[PDB]
Design a protein around this ligand. Structure first.
Ligand SMILES: CNc1cc(-c2ccc3[nH]ccc3c2)nc(S(C)(=O)=O)n1
Length: 108
């Protein structure tokens, strides 16, 4: 896989901001609050969120697009594992993952 260039990184920031602005992204914007989900961090061993990804983007943590996609997929995988399939939180992952794929393919 090809290294992420500085030109690549402008695109990644755009993709990330498109997701952060999505109406369904709210449960993913910041780390889960342990007060609203007291067992969350006993269940989910590798939490991830969009603020933690923004930090990594800004600090050029990602060297390959696959690593960026892997962090994003953890967000969605964590959500569907923690939540039952009829929860509104689960529905956020359904909507935002397919939005992400649309944007990812564009990033191309
Ligand atoms: C009850 N189920 C839930 C609850 C939450 C949650 C709760 C409070 C929160 N405060 C700041 C973020 C934040 C996220 N996130 C999910 S998630 C990431 O979609 O798996 N599922």
């Amino acid at each position: 896989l090809t290294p992420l260039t500085e030109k690549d990184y402008e695109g990644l920031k755009r993709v990330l901001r498109s997701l952060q602005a999505h109406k369904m992204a709210w449960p993913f914007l910041e780390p889960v609050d342990p007060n609203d989900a007291p067992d969350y961090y006993g269940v989910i061993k590798e939490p991830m969120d969009l603020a933690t990804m923004e930090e990594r983007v800004q600090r050029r943590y990602y060297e390959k697009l696959t690593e960026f996609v892997a962090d994003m997929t953890k967000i969605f995988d964590n959500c569907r594992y923690y939540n039952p399939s009829d929860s509104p939180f689960y529905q956020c992952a359904e909507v935002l993952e397919s939005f992400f794929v649309q944007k990812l393919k564009g990033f191309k």
